[PDB]
Amino acid sequence: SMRKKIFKPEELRQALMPTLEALYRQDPESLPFRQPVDPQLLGIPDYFDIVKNPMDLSTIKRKLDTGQYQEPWQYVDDVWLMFNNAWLYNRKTSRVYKFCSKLAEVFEQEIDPVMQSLG
Ligand SMILES: COc1ccc2c(c1)N(CCC/C=C/c1cccc3c1N[C@H](C)CC(=O)N3)CCC2
């Protein structure tokens, strides 16, 4: 039977970096997401009462550039984890919530065709 494809880091990078660059270019919308959450500096000391698995753009980038991803779905799941964290922690009337809803719309649009074309 057909086995699960493991990818060359170089192919994963060359196929998925663009969808990540599309998020990063949105400014200010990507600013909330660029850097691991510091609950002290951001003045949100209850952050980890609500979020339990942190994730950010800088973490996804390093994972991609040091080939820690073997399958493209691991990348996709990490992006959605970062967005689901934001939707869960922040109010619907907040900028981080609204920035999240907007970077999600961009991502769905970049990523859905890329995944058609990968094994
Ligand atoms: C307390 O905010 C600050 C203070 C100084 C400056 C801030 C924000 N901006 C944006 C930084 C990114 C915000 C990050 C952020 C700030 C408040 C709440 C959330 C944030 N995001 C991550 C995703 C955590 C989250 O869910 N909700 C840069 C200029 C200096």
Side-chain angles (χ1 to χ4, degrees), residues 1-9 11-13 15-20 22-119:
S1 59
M2 184 178 311
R3 292 169 186 281
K4 282 289 158 299
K5 195 168 171 166
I6 305 314
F7 285 81
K8 284 206 276 254
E11 247 163 50
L12 278 179
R13 202 174 301 115
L16 297 178
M17 198 51 72
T19 67
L20 195 64
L23 269 35
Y24 263 120
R25 253 204 318 293
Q26 311 310 316
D27 182 348
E29 279 88 356
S30 73
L31 294 190
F33 303 103
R34 294 220 180 163
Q35 284 300 328
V37 182
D38 180 338
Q40 194 147 284
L41 282 185
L42 291 177
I44 49 160
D46 66 338
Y47 181 78
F48 288 111
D49 302 335
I50 301 295
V51 178
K52 301 304 179 188
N53 302 262
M55 183 54 63
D56 81 285
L57 290 176
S58 65
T59 301
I60 300 164
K61 186 160 128 93
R62 177 181 336 120
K63 282 199 178 180
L64 195 47
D65 297 340
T66 68
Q68 283 181 42
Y69 286 133
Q70 310 133 67
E71 80 130 337
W73 276 101
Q74 287 167 342
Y75 163 81
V76 170
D77 282 350
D78 273 3
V79 167
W80 282 103
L81 174 59
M82 164 181 92
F83 294 148
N84 283 316
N85 285 352
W87 283 320
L88 176 62
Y89 180 65
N90 306 271
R91 272 87 168 206
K92 306 206 303 215
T93 51
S94 80
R95 169 169 282 164
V96 177
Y97 192 106
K98 294 191 160 137
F99 283 7
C100 188
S101 297
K102 196 76 192 179
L103 287 169
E105 280 182 343
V106 172
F107 188 58
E108 292 173 53
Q109 191 126 140
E110 285 287 309
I111 191 57
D112 275 350
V114 170
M115 294 301 283
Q116 301 289 29
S117 89
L118 292 173

